[PDB]
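Quick one: Calmodulin from Homo sapiens, structure tokens please.
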Amino acid sequence: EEEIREAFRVFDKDGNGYISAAELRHVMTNLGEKLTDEEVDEMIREADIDGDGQVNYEEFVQMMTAK
Ligand SMILES: [Ca+2]
Ligand SMILES: [Ca+2]
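--- reply ---
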């Protein structure tokens, strides 16, 4: 849907394909709830399921969607 994807398009402001923790916090800002840098690091954790040291779009799905 646009909600998830298109807002994700705004989320990736640069459209680089890759999400940083800092951008997680952006999405968090969009979400209303803004967590601090500390938590943003936890965003790497919760968002980084593949374990590459980065947050990607696939993982953006894997974080919310999960399994
Ligand atoms: Ca980005
Ligand atoms: Ca990753």
